[PDB]
Write a protein that binds this ligand. Structure first.
Ligand SMILES: NC(=O)C1=CN([C@@H]2O[C@H](COP(=O)(O)OP(=O)(O)OC[C@H]3O[C@@H](n4cnc5c(N)ncnc54)[C@H](OP(=O)(O)O)[C@@H]3O)[C@@H](O)[C@H]2O)C=CC1
Length: 303
């Protein structure tokens, strides 16, 4: 009952909150080394109950996800795998020669016959970074991969409204529209660019939130701390569980990470309580009065 648009694994299970394999876990690209540390983390999340893994070309953790998928007792068909074509950032250019090579590279490193969700990592690139590809051309690659069956569902990350419109226009039909936009979202940044959440939800695009624990993990002072403590006390939950439940009640799918078994287990235990509309609104209000953006500050400056 939480998500306005949602999906199922190939075996027909609910897409759960996503275990991230980016941020603190990411690696230099030229590494072929598996980080046993990360593999064990992914296996642990799967045992605890995660059924959604988020990775990306740029994190160079597709190989660790692939190793976990081989070693885990959970059927692959019961898992949702999200990955991303990474076009480059500042000095760094795209690791792959083309978006289409990126997808084939994801299948190979993950050791899967299909990806559930394949996103363009960001719309903030030039064709110099991508070795010759525009946003529309990258979108064509994803559309071809969906038509082939390499990828089940297609979307983008960090897209503002004008980027979504360009995708709609580059789609051959409605069946090929983006259906996910993964953005930074938490109470101090409830709209990564103007009106993004509402726009996505009104056009059938599932919003995913990365850095949903930013108030706990990223900021030096958390203006929500008293509110989250009060609600924590009330529900007998942690302040992290409160934030992740809040995100889900806003209709948004959280992508979160932790290296600690207890926090992973807790991240999953969100379905035995429910914030009130007023508690959700309390968090909305305090959050909007204390803006904080963790990522892509120059890119969003005028968006
Ligand atoms: N599409 C995009 O451009 C981006 C995508 N992402 C994806 O999202 C994933 C998660 O992003 P991230 O910003 O890490 O998301 P989170 O908001 O879930 O934060 C991760 C950090 O929160 C800490 N944490 C967890 N629980 C608590 C708690 N109870 N109290 C205090 N700290 C806590 C963790 O530390 P500990 O390990 O000690 O628990 C961890 O370091 C990435 O791994 C990547 O997959 C991320 C950023 C951009």
């Amino acid at each position: 009952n939480l998500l306005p648009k949602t999906f199922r694994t190939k075996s027909g299970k609910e897409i759960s909150i996503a275990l991230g394999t980016g941020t603190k876990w990411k690696q230099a690209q030229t590494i072929n080394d598996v980080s046993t540390e990360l593999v064990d983390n992914i296996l642990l999340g799967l045992k605890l109950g995660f059924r959604h893994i988020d990775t990306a070309e740029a994190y160079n953790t597709q190989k660790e996800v692939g190793e976990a998928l081989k070693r885990t007792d959970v059927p692959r068909e019961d898992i949702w795998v999200t990955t991303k074509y990474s076009p480059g950032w500042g000095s760094i250019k795209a690791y792959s020669k083309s978006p289409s090579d990126s997808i084939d590279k994801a299948l190979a490193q993950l050791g899967v016959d299909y990806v559930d969700l394949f996103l363009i990592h960001s719309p903030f690139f030039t064709t110099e970074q991508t070795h010759g590809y525009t946003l529309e051309q990258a979108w064509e690659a994803l559309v071809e991969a969906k038509k082939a069956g390499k990828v089940r569902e297609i979307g983008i990350s960090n897209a503002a409204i004008p980027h979504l419109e360009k995708l709609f226009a580059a789609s051959p039909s409605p069946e090929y529209y983006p259906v996910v936009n993964q953005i930074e979202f938490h109470p101090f940044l409830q709209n990564q660019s103007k009106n993004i959440v509402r726009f996505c939800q009104e056009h059938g695009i599932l919003v995913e939130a990365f850095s949903p624990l930013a108030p706990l993990a990223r900021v030096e002072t958390n203006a929500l701390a008293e509110t989250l403590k009060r609600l924590a006390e009330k529900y007998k939950k942690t302040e992290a569980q409160v934030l992740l439940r809040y995100t889900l009640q806003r209709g948004i799918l959280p992508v979160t990470t932790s290296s600690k078994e207890s926090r992973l287990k807790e991240s999953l235990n969100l379905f035995d309580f429910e914030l009130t509309d007023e508690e959700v609104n309390e968090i909305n209000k305090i959050g909007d009065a204390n803006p904080y953006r963790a990522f892509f500050h120059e890119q969003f400056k005028d968006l």
